[PDB]
Short mmCIF file of all heavy atoms in Angstrom, two decimals:
data_model
loop_
_atom_site.label_atom_id
_atom_site.label_comp_id
_atom_site.label_asym_id
_atom_site.label_seq_id
_atom_site.Cartn_x
_atom_site.Cartn_y
_atom_site.Cartn_z
N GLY A 1 166.16 179.16 84.52
CA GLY A 1 164.99 179.66 85.24
C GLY A 1 164.09 180.55 84.41
O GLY A 1 162.89 180.32 84.34
N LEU A 2 164.66 181.58 83.79
CA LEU A 2 163.89 182.43 82.89
C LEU A 2 163.64 181.76 81.55
O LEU A 2 162.63 182.04 80.89
CB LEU A 2 164.61 183.76 82.69
CG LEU A 2 164.50 184.74 83.86
CD1 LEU A 2 165.62 185.76 83.80
CD2 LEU A 2 163.14 185.42 83.86
N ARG A 3 164.55 180.88 81.11
CA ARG A 3 164.36 180.19 79.84
C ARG A 3 163.22 179.18 79.93
O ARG A 3 162.50 178.96 78.95
CB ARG A 3 165.66 179.50 79.43
N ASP A 4 163.05 178.54 81.09
CA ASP A 4 161.96 177.59 81.26
C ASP A 4 160.60 178.28 81.17
O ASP A 4 159.67 177.75 80.56
CB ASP A 4 162.09 176.87 82.60
CG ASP A 4 163.27 175.91 82.63
OD1 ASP A 4 164.41 176.39 82.74
OD2 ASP A 4 163.04 174.69 82.55
N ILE A 5 160.48 179.46 81.77
CA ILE A 5 159.19 180.14 81.84
C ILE A 5 158.83 180.75 80.48
O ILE A 5 157.75 180.49 79.93
CB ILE A 5 159.20 181.22 82.94
CG1 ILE A 5 159.60 180.61 84.28
CG2 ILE A 5 157.84 181.88 83.05
CD1 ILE A 5 159.96 181.64 85.33
N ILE A 6 159.72 181.56 79.93
CA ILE A 6 159.43 182.33 78.73
C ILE A 6 159.75 181.46 77.52
O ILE A 6 160.91 181.13 77.27
CB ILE A 6 160.23 183.64 78.69
CG1 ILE A 6 159.96 184.46 79.96
CG2 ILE A 6 159.85 184.45 77.47
CD1 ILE A 6 160.91 185.62 80.14
N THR A 7 158.72 181.10 76.76
CA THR A 7 158.90 180.39 75.51
C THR A 7 159.01 181.38 74.36
O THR A 7 159.00 182.60 74.55
CB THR A 7 157.74 179.42 75.28
OG1 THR A 7 156.53 180.15 75.07
CG2 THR A 7 157.57 178.49 76.47
N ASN A 8 159.14 180.86 73.14
CA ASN A 8 159.26 181.73 71.97
C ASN A 8 157.98 182.50 71.69
O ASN A 8 158.03 183.53 71.00
CB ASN A 8 159.65 180.90 70.75
CG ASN A 8 160.46 181.69 69.74
OD1 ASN A 8 161.20 182.60 70.10
ND2 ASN A 8 160.33 181.34 68.47
N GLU A 9 156.84 182.04 72.20
CA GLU A 9 155.55 182.66 71.92
C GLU A 9 155.02 183.51 73.07
O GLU A 9 153.90 184.01 72.98
CB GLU A 9 154.53 181.57 71.58
N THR A 10 155.79 183.69 74.14
CA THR A 10 155.34 184.44 75.31
C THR A 10 156.29 185.57 75.69
O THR A 10 156.19 186.10 76.80
CB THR A 10 155.16 183.50 76.51
OG1 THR A 10 156.41 182.90 76.84
CG2 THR A 10 154.14 182.42 76.19
N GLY A 11 157.19 185.96 74.81
CA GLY A 11 158.11 187.05 75.13
C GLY A 11 159.32 187.01 74.21
O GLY A 11 159.25 186.51 73.09
N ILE A 12 160.42 187.56 74.73
CA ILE A 12 161.68 187.63 74.00
C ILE A 12 162.78 187.05 74.88
O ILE A 12 162.65 186.98 76.11
CB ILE A 12 162.04 189.08 73.59
CG1 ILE A 12 160.81 189.83 73.08
CG2 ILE A 12 163.13 189.07 72.53
CD1 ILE A 12 160.25 189.30 71.78
N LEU A 13 163.86 186.61 74.24
CA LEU A 13 165.03 186.09 74.94
C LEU A 13 166.28 186.75 74.38
O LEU A 13 166.42 186.90 73.17
CB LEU A 13 165.13 184.57 74.80
CG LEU A 13 164.20 183.73 75.68
CD1 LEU A 13 164.33 182.26 75.36
CD2 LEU A 13 164.48 183.97 77.16
N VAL A 14 167.18 187.15 75.28
CA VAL A 14 168.39 187.88 74.91
C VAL A 14 169.57 187.27 75.65
O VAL A 14 169.41 186.71 76.74
CB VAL A 14 168.26 189.38 75.23
CG1 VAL A 14 169.57 190.09 74.98
CG2 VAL A 14 167.15 190.00 74.39
N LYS A 15 170.75 187.37 75.06
CA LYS A 15 171.96 186.87 75.70
C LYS A 15 172.31 187.73 76.91
O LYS A 15 172.17 188.95 76.89
CB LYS A 15 173.12 186.86 74.70
N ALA A 16 172.78 187.07 77.97
CA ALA A 16 173.11 187.78 79.19
C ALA A 16 174.32 188.68 79.00
O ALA A 16 175.31 188.29 78.36
CB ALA A 16 173.37 186.79 80.33
N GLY A 17 174.25 189.89 79.54
CA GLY A 17 175.38 190.80 79.51
C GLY A 17 175.83 191.18 78.11
O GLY A 17 177.04 191.25 77.85
N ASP A 18 174.89 191.43 77.21
CA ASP A 18 175.19 191.84 75.84
C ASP A 18 174.34 193.07 75.53
O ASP A 18 173.24 192.95 74.98
CB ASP A 18 174.92 190.70 74.85
CG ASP A 18 175.15 191.10 73.40
OD1 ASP A 18 174.59 192.12 72.96
OD2 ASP A 18 175.90 190.38 72.70
N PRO A 19 174.82 194.26 75.88
CA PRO A 19 173.99 195.46 75.69
C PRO A 19 173.50 195.65 74.26
O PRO A 19 172.37 196.11 74.06
CB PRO A 19 174.92 196.60 76.13
CG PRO A 19 175.88 195.97 77.07
CD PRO A 19 176.09 194.57 76.57
N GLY A 20 174.32 195.32 73.27
CA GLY A 20 173.88 195.47 71.89
C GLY A 20 172.66 194.63 71.58
O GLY A 20 171.71 195.10 70.94
N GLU A 21 172.66 193.37 72.03
CA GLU A 21 171.51 192.50 71.79
C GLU A 21 170.28 192.99 72.54
O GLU A 21 169.16 192.89 72.04
CB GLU A 21 171.84 191.07 72.18
CG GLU A 21 172.53 190.26 71.09
CD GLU A 21 171.66 190.08 69.85
OE1 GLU A 21 170.49 190.52 69.87
OE2 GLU A 21 172.15 189.50 68.86
N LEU A 22 170.47 193.52 73.75
CA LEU A 22 169.33 194.06 74.49
C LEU A 22 168.73 195.25 73.76
O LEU A 22 167.50 195.38 73.67
CB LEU A 22 169.77 194.45 75.90
CG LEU A 22 168.67 194.99 76.81
CD1 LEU A 22 167.56 193.97 77.00
CD2 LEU A 22 169.25 195.40 78.15
N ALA A 23 169.58 196.14 73.24
CA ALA A 23 169.08 197.28 72.47
C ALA A 23 168.35 196.81 71.22
O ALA A 23 167.30 197.35 70.85
CB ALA A 23 170.22 198.22 72.11
N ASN A 24 168.90 195.80 70.54
CA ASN A 24 168.24 195.27 69.35
C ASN A 24 166.88 194.68 69.69
O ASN A 24 165.90 194.86 68.96
CB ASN A 24 169.13 194.22 68.68
CG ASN A 24 170.34 194.83 68.02
OD1 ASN A 24 170.27 195.91 67.42
ND2 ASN A 24 171.48 194.15 68.12
N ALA A 25 166.79 193.95 70.81
CA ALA A 25 165.52 193.37 71.23
C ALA A 25 164.51 194.46 71.57
O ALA A 25 163.33 194.35 71.23
CB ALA A 25 165.73 192.45 72.42
N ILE A 26 164.96 195.52 72.24
CA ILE A 26 164.07 196.64 72.54
C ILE A 26 163.55 197.26 71.25
O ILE A 26 162.35 197.55 71.11
CB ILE A 26 164.79 197.67 73.42
CG1 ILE A 26 164.86 197.17 74.87
CG2 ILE A 26 164.08 199.02 73.35
CD1 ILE A 26 165.83 197.94 75.73
N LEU A 27 164.44 197.49 70.29
CA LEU A 27 164.02 198.07 69.02
C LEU A 27 163.02 197.17 68.31
O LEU A 27 162.02 197.65 67.75
CB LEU A 27 165.24 198.32 68.13
CG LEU A 27 166.10 199.52 68.52
CD1 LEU A 27 167.53 199.35 68.04
CD2 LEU A 27 165.50 200.80 67.97
N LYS A 28 163.27 195.86 68.31
CA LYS A 28 162.34 194.93 67.66
C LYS A 28 160.98 194.95 68.34
O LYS A 28 159.94 194.97 67.67
CB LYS A 28 162.93 193.52 67.67
N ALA A 29 160.96 194.94 69.67
CA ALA A 29 159.70 194.98 70.40
C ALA A 29 158.96 196.30 70.21
O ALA A 29 157.74 196.34 70.34
CB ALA A 29 159.94 194.74 71.89
#
């Protein structure tokens, strides 16, 4: 559902339930 909407050029994608990856994505953004 979220993967269909958000492409690589319209946002970020992170693995579900992985706080480390979410923090890394926040830092990158």
